[PDB]
């Protein structure tokens, strides 16, 4: 019970870590998106 | 443990949220790979 409560707290924490990692990756992905579109204009 | 079963259901639901988000991220990521692939084949 005491072990399960600590695990559940780490699970909710993990969900927050993964969410924040995906959000940061989405900002990076958006930067690469515009980097491509600009390259597409410059060479195509 | 109606409380505990609701928390677990919200966790499982959130994991489906996260899985769908990274599936969508992958489809967009695949486009950027191909776009770059197109450009580098040109240079």
């Amino acid at each position: 019970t005491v072990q399960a409560r600590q695990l559940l707290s780490g699970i909710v924490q993990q969900q927050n870590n993964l969410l924040r990692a995906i959000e940061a990756q989405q900002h990076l992905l958006q930067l690469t998106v515009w980097g491509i579109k600009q390259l597409q204009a410059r060479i195509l | 443990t109606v409380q505990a079963r609701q928390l677990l259901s919200g966790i499982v639901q959130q994991q489906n949220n996260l899985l769908r988000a990274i599936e969508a991220q992958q489809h967009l990521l695949q486009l950027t790979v191909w776009g770059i692939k197109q450009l580098q084949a040109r240079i």
């Binding site: 409560r5 559940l8 989405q26 998106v33 | 919200g10 959130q14 969508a24 991220q25 489809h27 967009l28």
Partner: peptide, 29 residues
Amino acid sequence: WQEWEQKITALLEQAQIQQEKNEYELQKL
């Protein structure tokens, strides 16, 4: 492109709502 970003953001919106919920229900336990 923009609407795959629209799909992604929307999925992260709902994950943010669910995170706040799960943190509340955990504290109640």
